[PDB]
Design a binder for this molecule. Structure first.
Ligand code: UDP
Length: 445
């Protein structure tokens, strides 16, 4: 593109949303050095994202957007409170800062790239006579679930709303219970997050193009519907293969430690950038761990003994590891690791498909439920813990099953062939490289 183009990038501050988006942006900015990229997110998220050294692509500048929290505000109860406050004032807070970036660069916005959550991107793009390109950072099946929100509700009564009778929502997908769906589709339909997702489903067809961090082999039938709902659908993932972003950090020699172990023998544990199993769960896992023998790596959450038992800490310090932050993508590509105990967030899922490792899923929130059903029943590269909770009986059951002598192997096989499609999809010749090239064209023109 030319030196007159200005791309505004609006990222979601919570969960693993902002980093994947920034990654996509970095790939584009490298290909288009004369194009200006303005990245908007909360001060706290920007601080974490832009602390990186020479990662300073010159044509990318970040701008802090108000987090919606009132003056003096203090934690309070539920961790949902700051998310709800952000959502409630995000449109005007984004606009205020976008306005500063336009006055400062002297360049009107030509393209608005946003997390798909930002349904208001169409309206904003409209006002500035700019293009709108939202990015759904999760899977195709959940995106389509949101596009189908009204349809689902219209075919949902007292039975289904209460898990008595299952709903047939997605093509080429098992029948689901309301508890399977992301909060908001059929429950708590009124809260800000739920309203944000519904509006997104309704506004997406107005976009110039809808990008998604996924690849065409993930779900053919779902993709076809999405393809018919939007002006353009672009599969630009998996991001771990299509975009840069370093992070090859092993402050705790996990990979070396992994070297000094054999194949499919280590248990990697990670429940995302925000989750930490409840008390009865952690304690059920920690013990499940040092009773199964299985060597392991566990990404806790900074806090060590804080939640974990003292003794346990220095008793397993010989057959397993526990870190605050691990080099997950690399760990998942290591031949040592045999199973991935995850909450099935989408990013971790794409990373596991690329690494070729079987999965143990204990979903918590959002799309994790649909993701578990997708990898357990449709891709068959994983299984979920019993009851969706972590109890010593449910854990061992899963470990034993995946680390078994049959099922675990097959899953590993199924995910190796999927891994193959992933690598193929990103060759210049594949659909992901091609949709990415198109994305670049739209964003930089
Ligand atoms: O020790 C860790 C734990 C997590 N992650 C990364 O954190 C992200 C988790 O995203 P996901 O969508 O799986 O779950 P979320 O954070 O949205 O709940 C993934 O990129 C993981 O690789 C990591 O790099 N090291």
């Amino acid at each position: 593109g030319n030196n007159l183009l200005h791309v505004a990038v609006l990222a979601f501050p919570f969960g693993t949303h902002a980093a994947p988006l920034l990654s996509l942006v970095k790939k584009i900015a490298t290909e288009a050095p004369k194009v200006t990229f303005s990245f908007f997110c909360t001060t706290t998220t920007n601080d974490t994202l832009f602390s990186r050294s020479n990662e300073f692509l010159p044509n990318i500048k970040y701008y802090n957007v108000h987090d919606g929290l009132p003056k003096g505000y203090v934690s309070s109860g539920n961790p949902r409170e700051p998310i709800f406050l952000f959502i409630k004032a995000m449109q005007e807070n984004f606009k205020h800062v976008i306005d500063e970036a336009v006055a400062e660069t002297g360049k009107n916005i030509t393209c608005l790239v946003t997390d798909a959550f930002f349904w208001f991107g169409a309206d904003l793009a409209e006002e500035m006579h700019a293009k709108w390109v939202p990015l759904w950072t999760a899977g195709p099946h959940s995106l389509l679930t949101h596009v189908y929100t009204d349809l689902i509700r219209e075919k949902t009564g007292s039975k289904e709303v209460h898990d008595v009778k299952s709903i047939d929502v997605l093509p080429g997908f098992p029948e689901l219970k309301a508890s399977d769906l992301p909060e908001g589709v059929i429950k708590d339909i009124d809260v800000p997050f739920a309203t944000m997702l519904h509006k997104m489903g309704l506004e997406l067809p107005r976009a110039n193009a809808v990008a998604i961090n996924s690849f065409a082999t993930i779900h053919p039938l779902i993709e076809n519907e999405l393809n018919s709902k939007f002006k353009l659908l672009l599969n630009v993932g998996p991001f771990n293969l299509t975009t840069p972003q370093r992070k090859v950090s092993d402050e705790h020699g996990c990979l070396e430690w992994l070297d000094q172990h054999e194949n499919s023998s280590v248990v990697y544990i990670s429940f995302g950038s925000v989750v930490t199993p409840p008390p009865h769960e952690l304690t059920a896992l920690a013990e499940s761990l040092e009773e199964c023998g299985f060597p392991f790596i566990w990404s806790f959450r900074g806090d060590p003994k804080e939640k974990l038992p003292k003794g346990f800490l220095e008793r397993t310090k010989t057959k397993g590891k526990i870190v605050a932050w691990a080099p997950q993508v690399e760990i998942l590509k290591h031949s040592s690791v045999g199973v991935f105990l995850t909450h099935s967030g989408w990013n971790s899922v794409l990373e596991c498909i690329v690494g070729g490792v079987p999965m143990i899923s204990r979903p918590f929130f959002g799309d994790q439920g649909l993701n578990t059903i997708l990898t357990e029943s449709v891709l068959e590269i994983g299984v979920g813990v019993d009851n969706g909770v972590l109890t010593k009986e449910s854990i061992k059951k899963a470990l034993e099953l995946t680390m078994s002598s049959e099922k675990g192997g097959i899953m590993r096989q199924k995910i190796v062939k999927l891994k193959e499609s992933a690598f193929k999809a990103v060759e210049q010749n594949g659909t992901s490289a091609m949709d990415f090239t198109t994305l670049i064209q739209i964003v930089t023109s």
